[PDB]
Amino acid sequence: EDPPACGSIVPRREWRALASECRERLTRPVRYVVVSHTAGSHCDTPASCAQQAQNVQSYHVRNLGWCDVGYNFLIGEDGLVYEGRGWNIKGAHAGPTWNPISIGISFMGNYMNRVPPPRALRAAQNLLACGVALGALRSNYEVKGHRDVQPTLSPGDRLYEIIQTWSHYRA
Amino acid sequence: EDPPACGSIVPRREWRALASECRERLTRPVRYVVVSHTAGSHCDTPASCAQQAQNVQSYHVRNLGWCDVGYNFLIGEDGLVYEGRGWNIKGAHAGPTWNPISIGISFMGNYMNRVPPPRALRAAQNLLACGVALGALRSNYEVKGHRDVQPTLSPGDRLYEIIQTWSHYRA
Numbered sequence A, B: 001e002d003p004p005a006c007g008s009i010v011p012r013r014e015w016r017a018l019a020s021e022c023r024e025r026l027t028r029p030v031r032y033v034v035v036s037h038t039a040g041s042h043c044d045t046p047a048s049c050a051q052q053a054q055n056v057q058s059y060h061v062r063n064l065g066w067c068d069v070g071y072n073f074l075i076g077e078d079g080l081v082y083e084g085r086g087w088n089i090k091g092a093h094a095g096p097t098w099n100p101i102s103i104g105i106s107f108m109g110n111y112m113n114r115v116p117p118p119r120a121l122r123a124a125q126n127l128l129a130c131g132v133a134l135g136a137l138r139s140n141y142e143v144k145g146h147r148d149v150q151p152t153l154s155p156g157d158r159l160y161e162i163i164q165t166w167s168h169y170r171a
């Protein structure tokens, strides 16, 4: 491993994640990033957000039968990025059309009547810049709201409005 | 505005920092990075750590009469980096010898008998990369611990041994 790391990401083990059983890799570089919200409870401390990351992963693995938390990454209102399937593994966030050609990041919480804090927003934007730097993402990658590629309300009305202001957002 | 980002650094305004009156500029790319601990209380949440940066700046400004908090950046156990004097303004952390030829980053707390969490350490190197990425830091920069340049116990026994294993650490 030649390691020149980017950003700060709370690795799987730190948030006590069940080992992954996922195997299908994504093709680098990836062109799309889909932004969703978990629709679950929010957290603003590394302690409560490690917890929530475990909770979301348990729901997906235990109730849905997936190989791993469905998201490649999760964003905490604590301002940290939590590692999901990562940069090289296909997620289960955006359907069978989009899961194979995109990176899915999800903000932990419901943003229909609520906006996430600046640090979460910064954590997300930063991860993406890091994805481009690492070669995992296309320099001209595109960001989509979950609701742009599926019939959901995800990533929440408030959060959707915000990501539409991002330079890489393409409806 | 002012920001399209970087290292997920909490900006001055977000931690409600008094405005700075400092004017001496550092000439990049900067050669050294000095690691210190505040020797103040620690905090592990965005709220408590925003308050703790305010508390440190308050002391430096109102009581020591400094133009702004002396550190270029502060590191909270919440895993975040707090904007201090920044990449361009000379700091007041390591004396007249080192202040003009280095960037000073301080871990908020006393690390003599305590160890800073992995995320705090992550935010630090993540911070230092962001540095190089902007040309704020020297591609091959060197990390020195407070006690390597001044008669002090800073940055603490426990934190000092860790930074001793960093790939850029020097004595």
Ligand SMILES: CCCCCCCCCCCCCCCC(=O)Oc1ccc([N+](=O)[O-])cc1
Residues within 6 Å of the ligand: A004, A005, A006, A007, A126, A129, A130, A133, A134, B004, B005, B006, B007, B129, B130, B133
């Ligand atoms: C010779 C040893 C190998 C060293 C060469 C490879 C190192 C590449 C390391 C990449 C990881 C750190 C890069 C940080 C990138 C980053 O997020 O900075 C930004 C720079 C600019 C913006 N922006 O949009 O304004 C946002 C972010």
